[PDB]
């Protein structure tokens, strides 16, 4: 009865899990972490209890199991990476993070002005014929594929790409001194 040789584990191993707790709590410094560790150790020991020799000391086996499980926990915690809890991340921390982010904490002013039109580039675009400029739009600003540009333009691909070249040349002419 291999299922009976497991219930015998339920008779012997269960009692000592109390002192196993005591020890794991002395190890982890935290009650909840001690409970998590005790459960992990019990799972590890029960899964491969076939390796437990009958009639021999079982407390030391589970003790080494718990110590090794704690070592594995720390090894996995090395690359946590370094998470710390706080009741609230501070404005200092938020701004200091924005000091290295892709986009900073933006202002209502920044947003509202961004919404406004860039007169220089708007004037440089209004110069080109609205066909070649519509093409440079569908191709550069929006990034459509040239096939989709030909589709939405109702024109062949060659005309679309020729308008693209001519308009890019023109606007680089007017926007070269502007770009800088």
């Amino acid at each position: 009865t291999d299922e009976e040789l497991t219930a015998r584990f339920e008779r012997d191993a269960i009692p000592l899990l109390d002192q196993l707790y005591g020890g794991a709590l002395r190890m982890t410094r935290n009650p909840a972490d001690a409970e998590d560790l005790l459960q992990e150790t019990m799972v590890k020991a029960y899964a491969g209890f076939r390796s437990f020799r009958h009639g021999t000391n079982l407390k030391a086996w589970l003790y080494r199991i718990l110590t090794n499980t704690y070592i594995n926990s720390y090894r996995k915690k090395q690359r946590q990476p370094a998470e710390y809890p706080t009741e609230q991340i501070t404005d200092w921390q938020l701004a200091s993070n924005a000091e290295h982010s892709s986009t900073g904490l933006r202002s209502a002013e920044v947003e509202a002005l961004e919404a406004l039109p860039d007169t220089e580039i708007k004037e440089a675009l209004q110069a080109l014929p609205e066909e070649f400029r519509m093409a440079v739009y569908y191709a550069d600003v929006e990034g459509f594929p040239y096939k989709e540009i030909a589709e939405i333009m109702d024109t062949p691909i060659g005309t679309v790409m020729s308008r693209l070249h001519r308009g890019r040349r023109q606007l680089r002419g007017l926007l070269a001194d502007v770009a800088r």
């Binding site: 690359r79 946590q80 990476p81 998470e83």
Partner: protein, 45 residues
């Protein structure tokens, strides 16, 4: 439009909790330490 008429509470049934959700998180992993990218199915997935 800031012209609501009433605001009401009630215990949420698991049905409401799942209708709200956009997916269930499964792992304790949060972000990839190296690439600073959210681990999938984690608390930041």
């Amino acid at each position: 439009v800031n012209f609501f008429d009433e605001l009401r509470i009630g215990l949420a049934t698991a049905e409401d909790i799942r209708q709200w959700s956009y997916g269930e998180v499964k792992k304790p992993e949060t972000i990839n330490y190296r690439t600073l990218k959210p681990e999938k199915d984690g608390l930041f997935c």
